[PDB]
Amino acid sequence: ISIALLPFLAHGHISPFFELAKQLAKRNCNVFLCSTPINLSSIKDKDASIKLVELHLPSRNAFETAGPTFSEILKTLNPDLLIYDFNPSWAPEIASSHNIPAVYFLTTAAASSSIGLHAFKNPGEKYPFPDFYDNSNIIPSADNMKLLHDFIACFERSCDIILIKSFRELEGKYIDLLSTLSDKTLVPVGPLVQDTEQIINWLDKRAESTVVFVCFGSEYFLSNEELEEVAIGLEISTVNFIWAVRLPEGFVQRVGDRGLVVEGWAPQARILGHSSTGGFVSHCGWSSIAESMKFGVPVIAMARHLDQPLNGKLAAEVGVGMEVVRDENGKYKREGIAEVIRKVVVEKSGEVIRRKARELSEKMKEKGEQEIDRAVEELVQICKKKKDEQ
Numbered sequence: 001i002s003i004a005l006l007p008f009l010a011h012g013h014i015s016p017f018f019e020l021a022k023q024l025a026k027r028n029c030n031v032f033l034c035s036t037p038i039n040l041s042s043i044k045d046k047d048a049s050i051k052l053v054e055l056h057l058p059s060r061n062a063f064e065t066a067g068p069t070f071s072e073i074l075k076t077l078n079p080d081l082l083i084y085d086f087n088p089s090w091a092p093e094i095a096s097s098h099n100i101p102a103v104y105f106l107t108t109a110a111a112s113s114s115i116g117l118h119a120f121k122n123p124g125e126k127y128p129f130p131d132f133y134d135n136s137n138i139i140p141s142a143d144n145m146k147l148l149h150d151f152i153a154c155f156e157r158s159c160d161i162i163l164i165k166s167f168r169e170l171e172g173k174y175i176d177l178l179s180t181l182s183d184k185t186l187v188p189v190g191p192l193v194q195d196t197e198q199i200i201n202w203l204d205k206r207a208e209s210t211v212v213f214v215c216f217g218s219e220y221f222l223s224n225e226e227l228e229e230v231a232i233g234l235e236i237s238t239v240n241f242i243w244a245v246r247l248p249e250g251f252v253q254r255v256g257d258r259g260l261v262v263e264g265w266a267p268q269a270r271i272l273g274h275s276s277t278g279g280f281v282s283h284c285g286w287s288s289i290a291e292s293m294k295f296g297v298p299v300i301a302m303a304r305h306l307d308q309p310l311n312g313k314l315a316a317e318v319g320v321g322m323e324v325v326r327d328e329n330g331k332y333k334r335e336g337i338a339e340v341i342r343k344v345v346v347e348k349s350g351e352v353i354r355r356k357a358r359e360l361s362e363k364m365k366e367k368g369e370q371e372i373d374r375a376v377e378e379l380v381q382i383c384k385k386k387k388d389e390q
């Protein structure tokens with residue numbers, strides 16, 4: 001009944017854990033507990049769950065040292081189950097030292113994880129779905145070696161089931177692959193979407209499904225030359241657009257009101273949910289795609305590093321978006337962006353895409369709630385099995 005959550009010390013990981021807390025606490029009267037430092041706790045002071053504090057010990061940070069602190073926290077709570085992240089490393093160890101089942105939560109796509117888990121569990125290599133990853137390539141980094149170890153470990157430490165912030169409609173094939181690879185029952189919980197006025201006032205005065213949202217920055221990388229390239233792409237697309245930047249860089253006084261730029265935080269969920277939106281030029285972050293496909297918005301894939309290229313090519317495989325064609329020197333170009341923007345948002349050829357993103361969206365709003373219901377009842381199963389084990 002009582003569940004405990006230890007999200008990693010990353011804002012890119014706190015929101016899924018908090019939304020999962022809201023989802024599990026509202027059903028089956030789950031006595032909820034969430035453990036993370038006060039700094040990361042006081043940012044989500046909004047709307048059934050109980051929060052916890054954590055004090056580190058003074059003399060990538062000191063999170064690997066809060067072992068005994070979390071041990072005392074668990075000895076205090078003694079919860080029925082712990083849902084940990086991926087980098088705590090000692091969270092399943094401490095959960096076992098208190099005889100608490102540890103369930104691993106993966107806030108990432110299943111195919112990106114399947115690549116690595118299959119490279120690990122099968123040095124017989126091969127890939128059952130090779131339209132994604134193929135062989136006949138050569139690559140080599142201790143940076144990535146540590147990451148992959150932290151990745152496999154948290155995949156093995158999970159008890160029976162592995163929670164994942166994804167759904168079957170996008171990659172149930174890869175979900176079942178991950179299940180058969182890790183020998184654990186992959187239980188999806190769907191996406192976890194949370195939730196000044198000038199943006200709304202401008203977006204309401206437009207036609208339906210004629211505006212393209214852009215947020216390739218998303219608090220990562222964005223150079224002025226790349227700013228110029230994506231700006232010329234947006235301009236020669238002759239389309240209404242709302243672009244959010246991180247921080248010469250164009251002439252907004254010139255192509256104003258046909259578009260709109262924001263310096264920092266935009267209502268991404270509210271913009272994508274608006275009926276006048278029909279495009280999302282994204283960096284292919286997992287949370288971004290999970291939000292985009294929930295509102296029936298196709299995905300212009302401008303990927304770069306990490307798991308984003310795999311997410312983008314998965315979206316292209318399921319036919320809910322399209323990727324930009326990089327130029328000769330491996331860089332997206334004005335035309336490489338405008339081509340796909342026009343072919344997706346306004347062209348009749350991309351209607352297929354435009355339709356699938358809608359046909360999928362309703363499905364997510366049709367089978368909702370029951371995903372997390374089955375996830376909750378599977379957790380009750382593991383706890384009861386543990387008690388029966390004695």
Ligand SMILES: CC(C)=CCC[C@](C)(O[C@@H]1O[C@H](CO)[C@@H](O)[C@H](O)[C@H]1O)[C@H]1CC[C@]2(C)[C@@H]1[C@H](O)C[C@@H]1[C@@]3(C)CC[C@H](O[C@@H]4O[C@H](CO)[C@@H](O)[C@H](O)[C@H]4O)C(C)(C)[C@@H]3CC[C@]12C
Binds near residue numbers: 147
């Ligand atoms: C083993 C081998 C032989 C080849 C396969 C690996 C691969 C093809 O890539 C090969 O990797 C090889 C490594 O040796 C090299 O040869 C070469 O680089 C390349 O070919 C690609 C494909 C699968 C891959 C994408 C992998 C990457 O590497 C490592 C990632 C990583 C583990 C990176 C950190 C990411 O976490 C976020 O990012 C920040 C840091 O945690 C956080 O702040 C943020 O919040 C998080 O969301 C998360 C989302 C967890 C992913 C999960 C997916 C994974 C496994």
